[PDB]
């Protein structure tokens, strides 16, 4: 249905399917109308992390320590304090942390309980391990004027070098940083210990691959090409492939939805791998 | 109409005669409609 | 349409020509319509 | 090739009525839309009314109103034609067929409220299988 | 709503051509585009067999020197190399308004 509300239009449109599903040419469904409504995202605003600083009101102090060495909690010999806290982008991510800050000394390995396996490990890289991620579809916008007066943003035609989107890491410098995350992991299970890494368990898509950020579009990377690695006991180049969602769940918070309208033109966002995830 | 906004669909309910009135088995009509919305 | 939401009923009305532009006895359009939405 | 199958041929006193059956093989008459065509010997063809297959729909030829009914048993099994009032102009053979429609959609109007106001209208297609006829003498 | 079939009665030599005149009062013609015309043949002692439906597109098995055109009000049935079976009456029937209706019917013999 168009503005004129009397007489429907037959229009067109491209749609991945992973935002469809078959119903029971063939019958298909926006997956997102069996859980709930859905939002376009005006094209006006973007999703650019911007560095927040955080301020305490008159009577509240913020403390910052400058200790180099830091367990995760307990005292701290050079203790400072500021106004308010540096310059943090927001940047919603999961595996991966990118566009964070650096750690001094070595590796940083901090955790609730190290020896619980159902906590988690938070691990903090010493330099910037750079991640460069492309989608080579010069694709236009045919808009869609379903008014009255609002108007969506559909996905016009795909043209160009039609490759599946992917990241290129440097391997090299992969395995040199993650060397030197199992140094650590060695200080704190033995001199003759074996560790092994592998992908996720599977599930959800979006615990599985890779979500992050990049100008609007929402990228699922399979980082199985990353961790897939082991250490004993004492270019080159990595492609990962990834995979486009117009329909996103945020925070995991069921009952909602959000669309994101396509973006015209080749999109070659970048970003550095400062942290991970690890169970 | 439920969910799938394009193809109805026949139900059944029950409604007490205080709720309903006769339009004009007969047509009824839910009292409210004549005043205003009703919210649940 | 009116509030009977089942069957719907001709009325008319009259208004000024500044109001109405021709589409394309003729057919019109409230001039309102192709820039936004207006409300009474 | 739907074989149709039509009550016997009648006499009947000017006054009276008729009621003539049909049957159509493998049930087709769920599916396929009921027609009924008279025609008196040396003379032309003429369409009496008909029955969707779907149940929802009834015609009649403005001569018929008030004189015929079209009817069918539950499951459509028996397909049924009763003309009342005969007169010697009655005297004709009456065929049951079948025939195809287009129910296209003429007005429509979108509402963006809910759901839209939509008006469909059975057009006959085609006129299939004709039965043998029933011979009904005034 | 009216028809008018024309001629009503026309010998054809066999071999030659015929050509038979359906004419409405209200155009045929669905606002889809399709006209709601069909020719049907009655041989004597026979029920009748549909020639062309939606007024261009002849039925299953008819040959093809029967050929249907016309849109709006006035329909044509060309019938080219007439033979013996091919005569009988030609119907025309419009399937546009209810009620329904049967032409009056040409005649057609050798």
């Known amino acids: 249905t168009t503005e004129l509300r009397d007489k429907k239009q037959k229009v067109y449109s491209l749609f991945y399917r992973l935002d469809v599903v078959q119903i029971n040419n063939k019958e298909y469904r926006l997956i997102n109308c069996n859980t709930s409504a859905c939002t376009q995202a005006c094209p006006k605003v973007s999703f650019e992390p911007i560095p927040i600083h955080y301020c305490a009101p008159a009577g509240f102090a913020i403390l910052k320590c400058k200790d180099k060495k830091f367990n995760g909690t307990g005292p701290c010999p050079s203790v400072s304090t500021v106004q308010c806290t540096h310059g943090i982008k927001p940047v919603v991510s999961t595996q991966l942390l990118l566009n964070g800050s650096l750690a001094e000394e070595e590796v940083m390995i901090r955790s609730e309980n190290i020896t619980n396996n159902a906590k988690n490990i938070l691990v903090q890289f010493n330099t910037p391990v750079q991640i460069n991620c492309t989608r080579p579809n010069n694709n236009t916008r045919k808009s869609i004027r379903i008014g009255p007066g609002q108007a969506f943003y559909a996905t016009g035609d795909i043209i160009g070098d039609i490759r599946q989107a992917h990241c290129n890491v440097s391997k090299a410098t992969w395995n040199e940083t993650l060397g030197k995350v199992v140094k650590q992991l060695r200080k704190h299970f033995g001199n003759n210990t074996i560790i092994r890494f592998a992908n996720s368990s599977g599930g959800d898509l979006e615990v599985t691959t890779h979500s992050f950020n990049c100008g609007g579009e929402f990228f699922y990377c399979n980082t199985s090409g990353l961790f897939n690695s082991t250490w004993i006991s004492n270019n080159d180049s990595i492609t990962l492939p990834c995979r486009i969602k117009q329909i996103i769940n945020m925070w995991q918070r069921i009952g909602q939805c959000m669309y994101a309208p396509p973006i015209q033109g080749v999109i070659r966002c970048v970003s550095n791998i400062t942290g991970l995830i690890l169970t | 109409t439920t969910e799938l906004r394009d193809k109805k669909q026949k139900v059944y309910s029950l409604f007490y005669r205080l709720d309903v009135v006769q339009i004009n088995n007969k047509e009824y009509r839910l009292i409210n409609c004549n005043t205003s919305a009703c919210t649940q | 349409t009116t509030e009977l939401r089942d069957k719907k009923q001709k009325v008319y009305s009259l208004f000024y020509r500044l109001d109405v532009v021709q589409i394309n006895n003729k057919e019109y359009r409230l001039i309102n319509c192709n820039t936004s939405a207006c409300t009474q | 090739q739907v074989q149709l199958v039509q009550s016997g041929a009648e006499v009947k006193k000017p006054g009276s009525s008729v009621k003539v059956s049909c049957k159509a093989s493998?049930?087709?008459?769920?599916?396929?839309?009921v027609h009924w065509v008279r025609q008196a010997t040396g003379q032309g063809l003429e369409w009496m009314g008909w029955?969707?297959?779907?149940?929802?729909?009834?015609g009649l030829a403005q001569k018929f109103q008030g004189r015929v009914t079209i009817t069918r048993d539950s499951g459509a099994s028996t397909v049924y034609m009763e003309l009342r009032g005969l007169t010697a102009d009655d005297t004709a053979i009456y065929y049951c067929?079948?025939?195809?429609?287009?129910?296209?959609?003429?007005?429509?109007?979108?509402?963006?409220?809910?759901?839209?106001?939509?008006?469909?209208?059975?057009?006959?297609?085609?006129?299939?299988?004709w039965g043998h006829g029933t011979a009904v003498t005034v | 709503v009216v028809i008018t079939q024309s001629p009503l009665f026309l010998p054809v030599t066999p071999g030659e051509a015929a050509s038979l005149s359906c004419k409405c009062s209200?155009?045929?013609?669905?606002?889809?585009?399709?006209?709601?015309l069909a020719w049907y043949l009655q041989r004597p002692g026979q029920t009748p067999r549909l020639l062309i439906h939606?007024?261009?597109h002849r039925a299953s098995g008819v040959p093809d020197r029967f050929s249907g055109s016309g849109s709006g009000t006035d329909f044509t049935l060309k019938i080219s190399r007439v033979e013996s079976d091919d005569v009988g009456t030609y119907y025309c029937?419009?399937?546009?308004?209810?009620?329904?209706?049967f032409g009056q019917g040409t005649k057609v013999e050798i």
């Open positions: 067929l079948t025939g195809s429609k287009h129910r296209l959609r003429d007005y429509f109007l979108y509402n963006e409220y809910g759901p839209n106001y939509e008006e469909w209208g059975d057009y006959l297609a085609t006129l299939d299988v």
């Open positions: 493998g049930n087709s008459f769920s599916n396929h839309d």
């Open positions: 029955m969707s297959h779907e149940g929802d729909k009834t």
């Open positions: 209200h155009s045929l013609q669905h606002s889809t585009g399709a006209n709601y």
């Open positions: 939606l007024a261009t």
């Open positions: 029937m419009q399937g546009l308004h209810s009620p329904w209706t």
